[PDB]
Design a binder for this molecule. Structure first.
Ligand SMILES: [Mg+2]
Ligand SMILES: [Mg+2]
Ligand SMILES: [Mg+2]
Ligand SMILES: [Mg+2]
Lengths: 162, 163, 163, 163
């Protein structure tokens, strides 16, 4: 199991089922899973920072990232690979030391280049097949939590200890 | 796949799971799936315009349509076949060259007329049986994206080409 | 058997039991658009539909209006009495009523109607009261399913309304 | 095992763990109407119900009020000590308590109560802490399932209440 010094994640399709609610005025909702917050916990327990890369720019994600003590947030990302480089360079780590989870076309380049790639079970096939680990969960089912636990090797003794 | 020059689509039951959210104050919601934006991508990638027909008329659909850069939007449509037939005429295209995806009663006449008919796995049986291709996904699960990829025969080459 | 009136519960039938609350006193319910056909099948035959619910919301008032439901009763704790009172006013007995419900406040009425329906999602003790098999769960079009079975809605009936 | 108090977590038990955030980040939760019957069975058997939660929302307060929950502790930093604190005030032991929760911060309490439940949706490490089998996931009416098993609710009990 590789050495991971950064954990990065997409939001829609990973922390959610891809759901995007719109009301008659064009306001938007998203639905996260409380199970995913434990992903942050295990990460921080092992001394690893967590970053979010998203193409959108919403208070929804800013707040949720704030709720969960996420270390790095990049919104309005036009090129997720560029986003991860920048952050890696700033952290002084290489892409090989990154575990990233994404679910769609704009996640492909970065997924083909990270140390560990995860893709939820809900995702398109040609993205799915880029996953270097088996994830059973679908987007919004707690797959970010599943991703982190597997990447970090969280066992029973890990659970007991906390 | 037969040759398609226009992809048409219903909303409720296709882009959503049929869900209609009502609150106490007169507001309404729909739940879309980001997954389906890639159906628009692929269509435009293959030079194919996308049109939306819906019986209802909500700002909910108008805004979503603009976000996804949909080419044609027709709301308040009571006769969807009549709507499809007029848009075909303006485009100078035939109905056999149209791919339509729908899920309910008011979609049935048009489904029987297009070149490729798609119906989500969640649709009532009397409509599902009209699909001329097999669709595994349910409404709101990315069935629109699945419809577009199949109808256009999007493959791994098309994927390697964009990344 | 000959049905003259369709009655129905809301939460757990027209929805999956989901009750969305925010922080300000507002609420959601998520209905399914394919259920609106259930009303259509009923009205196409000249049969009214009524709603019996123990909650009282502007949500259901709005949805019932949009759907042109004939009878709406809210804040009902005694559904069996409320149904009989309507039946008396209609000149029918309960043996001519089809009722679909999902919980304890529905138990008495289900044991007494001509045809009782209970969604696949329902608690076992209520599910066993159903006199017809229903495959769908709350919020998945189980009301439409119920209406179609109760009214013997066949492929033949389907071709007719899409003429 | 005789139970004098039932305690429950919210998110992941009364919900599928979904945390809805609106455009400005305000929260909604989806409850299931089926779970209220868990309150009803508790009170039928003369057992008070308590809610423990780390979050503090008006969402939970309104629902608790609506369901006539006996005890409500919010902003709880350690669920076990809050539970200890209430049991001390009521003069009961954790052994006389049944608790259902679903994540890490429930683990310590789950190991202390007389009957522990954990929903089928929960993380493996927490699920194994459950002392009775629960088939339902969070949001599916698993609080109700939990109470009916704990209290040994039989068809006899059901028949008794619908007379
Ligand atoms: Mg995504
Ligand atoms: Mg539709
Ligand atoms: Mg109900
Ligand atoms: Mg919880």
């Amino acid at each position: 199991m590789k050495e991971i010094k950064l954990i990065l994640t997409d939001i829609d399709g990973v922390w959610t089922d891809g759901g995007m609610f719109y009301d008659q005025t064009g306001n938007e909702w998203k639905k996260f899973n409380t199970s995913d917050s434990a992903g942050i916990f295990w990460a921080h327990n092992k001394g690893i920072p967590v970053g979010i890369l998203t193409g959108a720019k919403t208070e929804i994600v800013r707040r949720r990232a704030e709720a969960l003590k996420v270390d790095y947030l990049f919104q309005g990302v036009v090129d997720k690979l560029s986003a991860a480089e920048e952050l890696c360079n700033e952290l002084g780590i290489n892409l090989e030391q990154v575990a990233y989870i994404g679910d769609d076309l704009n996640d492909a380049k970065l997924l083909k280049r990270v140390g560990i790639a995860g893709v939820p079970a809900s995702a398109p096939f040609y993205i799915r097949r880029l996953s270097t680990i088996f994830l059973e969960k679908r987007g919004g089912e707690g797959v970010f939590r599943e991703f982190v636990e597997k990447v970090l090797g969280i066992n029973l003794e890990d659970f007991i200890a906390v």
